[PDB]
Write a protein that binds this ligand. Structure first.
Ligand SMILES: Cc1c([C@H](O)C2[C@H](O)CCC[C@H]2O)ccc2c1c(=O)n(Cc1ccco1)c(=O)n2C
Ligand SMILES: Cc1c([C@H](O)C2[C@H](O)CCC[C@H]2O)ccc2c1c(=O)n(Cc1ccco1)c(=O)n2C
Ligand SMILES: [Co+2]
Ligand SMILES: [Co+2]
Lengths: 380, 380
């Protein structure tokens, strides 16, 4: 059931912005690790004395890495004379963010029809304003409201990347590509799911995306065409294995973004290319499941991909779940940084053709039960 | 003239420690970029709740990358119960360091016979104590005194990497190597060279290493066998091209480490391997000199390396200078991070054989005049 109750017109995910202490080093590690191209910059070379910002791109996926310069570089400026290309940026907010959380996502940015309307309707419906709408170079409008923890939902709208960014020179832009094409979903961990759901659903009009005892309870908010998907988790206390959600909240100093799920047009090529570079600057993957997993996946997805492909899934350590309209392939990286907080998910969806509809396959919650069962089978 | 006046027995450079906000991402960028192996760790996986520390190695070169966890992880601990493997570490000092300077070197660590004596004699001779000597696991003694800015000279001594670090598992350690073998010199920028020289020379007994109007004035302190080399720069104000030293001090918020010079056993292989990876996660190099440089280098170093090698120097953009005992090959990277502060120098020294004596060739100051002259020649 999709009551299509969006309070403003939303399009798709536009970019994800990381706040860090050195944008250069994070951007180059991510670029090599995920096979994303260096496509735009805003920094000293472009006259920005406030923040260094570098954009990586793969397909429609846009990763933005920003860090503050010394405030002394811009001490004579005021907000009307700023040289920041992103007007919401704040030295104190960014330093406080990185030192409280470590490396992580500051903004989940969705493109909308009208960022001023989106901000107005949002706050009129309970959103906590973060940065009021500002029109950049008569071309682009940008506005921010609080999402959870210190993460903001960022609205961007185009009358026709951002003003004041520069296209990178082709000799500095190497066309890496491991198959990743767009952001599928972005997931937050909070201490209490109920109030978090109520707040966000309340100011966007996003509806609960339907689904179908380890870790969490979760629920997925979705826009009208279910292309913008925002799952949210809370811990399940009092178990025997400590919830990784509660571990997240302890090491992250509170609520925040847990994982980004990136869609690949060919998860086999992606995971081969990423695994090649794991121990030479790229990303580590979570430990593979026992072969009993792949010894049971013929009995569940054997109509969807051949035994040659299921064997190919066994080498790369890929998980496979299934809804009632589609099948989901997925795997999880180790944490992107020092703390056991944010990680990335690689996914590919098969089914639900009309274009592919959003969320085809679900999000893999079944893989929890399948994993534990596959563990016990292997053990004995 | 070498009066060999060291006030305590010094051996060689032991490691360089970077303070950052995320150790993981800097370490992986440096590892791929410079061809250094991941060899030791101290972090949550090893029971350290205070700081994450990862060591990269290439030959005798040891790069340490450290960042703080949330203080909340270790709030119950006191200095006697600490789980930090490096006792000098301090959350507040490290956060304040990264937010004031951005990415940079916190410690230049030299190995000594007796770190307690080294610290005692040092402070008795004007050194500002930074961290008193502490004996780690009855095996290693560690002590710190201020060097310049927020950089400390770190003494380490072994009765027989550090206690509480772990050897990395071979499946996580990929044996990268681009030829780099040891740290040659570490260079500081200060606002006033005179007082800086007087202070450091005063508490170490290091002597002025002999040399032989753009940029700087500099002077090199050296230990008895001139293997530990600490050059220091100050700006030359009132020119026409702004001193890069003064630019350093403005963007770094004061004095600090300017460049690390890394010796390669084969600078041609090193620079080929590093240049291959420049735009896929590695390091950028400063713009090459005009071919007029290489058109004049036959007339100055033509007795040292063939015209085939001088042509090989032209492709890689390598500089060549010459003292009266040796010849120096060198090239400079772009800044390692967001700010125009720290950069790395790759060098190889030929001559002064007895083993090779320290500083063989000098440090390339002549390449300043040669560069400007080679510019003007090309232009007309
Ligand atoms: C993050 C995740 C997901 C979903 O993506 C996520 C949805 O997006 C949104 C709501 C549900 C929520 O779970 C699904 C399966 C997972 C994991 C996951 O992190 N791990 C690793 C792990 C090891 C020990 C503890 O967790 C897994 O094993 N499985 C199977
Ligand atoms: C750092 C450096 C050195 C020495 O290593 C250093 C010694 O270690 C210790 C004392 C002297 C001191 O200069 C030598 C030659 C250099 C550079 C250097 O940074 N650049 C780049 C640049 C472009 C514009 C402004 O600077 C150069 O061109 N040349 C030729
Ligand atoms: Co997911
Ligand atoms: Co040098």
């Amino acid at each position: 059931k999709n009551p299509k109750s969006d309070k403003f017109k939303v399009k798709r995910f536009h970019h994800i912005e990381f706040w860090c202490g050195d944008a250069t080093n994070v951007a180059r590690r991510f670029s090599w690790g995920l096979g994303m191209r260096f496509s735009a910059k805003s920094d000293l070379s472009t006259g920005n004395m406030v923040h260094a910002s570098y954009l990586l791109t793969s397909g429609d996926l846009r990763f933005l890495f920003t860090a503050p310069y010394s405030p002394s570089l811009s001490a004579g400026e005021i907000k009307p004379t700023t040289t920041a290309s992103i007007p919401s940026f704040d030295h104190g907010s960014c330093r406080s963010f990185f030192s409280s959380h470590g490396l992580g996502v500051r903004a989940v940015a969705i493109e909308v029809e009208d960022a001023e309307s989106a901000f107005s309707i949002s706050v009129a419906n309970g959103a906590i304003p973060s940065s009021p709408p500002i029109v950049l170079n008569e071309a682009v409008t940008i506005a921010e409201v609080k999402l959870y923890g210190d993460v903001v939902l960022r609205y961007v709208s185009y009358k026709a990347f951002l003003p004041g960014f520069e296209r990178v020179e082709d000799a500095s832009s190497f066309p890496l590509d491991y198959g990743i094409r767009r952001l599928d979903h972005a997931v937050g961990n909070v201490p209490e799911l109920g109030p978090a759901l109520t707040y966000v659903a309340g100011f966007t009009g996003f509806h609960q995306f339907a689904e179908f005892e380890s870790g969490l309870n979760s629920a997925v908010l979705a826009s009208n065409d279910e292309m913008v998907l925002l799952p949210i988790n809370e811990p399940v206390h009092g178990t025997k294995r400590k919830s990784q959600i509660q571990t997240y909240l302890e090491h992250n100093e509170g609520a925040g973004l847990q994982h980004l799920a990136l869609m690949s047009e060919d998860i086999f090529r992606t995971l081969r290319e990423m695994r090649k570079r794991s121990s030479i600057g790229g990303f580590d993957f979570m430990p593979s499941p026992p072969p009993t997993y792949y010894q049971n996946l013929k009995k569940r997805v054997g109509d969807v991909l051949s035994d040659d492909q299921i064997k190919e899934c066994e080498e790369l350590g890929i998980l496979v779940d299934r809804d009632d309209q589609g099948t989901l392939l997925q795997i999880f990286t180790k944490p992107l940084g020092d703390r056991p907080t944010i990680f990335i998910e690689i996914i590919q969806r098969v089914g639900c053709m009309m274009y592919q509809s959003g969320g085809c396959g679900g999000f893999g919650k079944g893989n929890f039960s399948e994993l534990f069962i596959s563990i016990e089978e292997y053990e004995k």
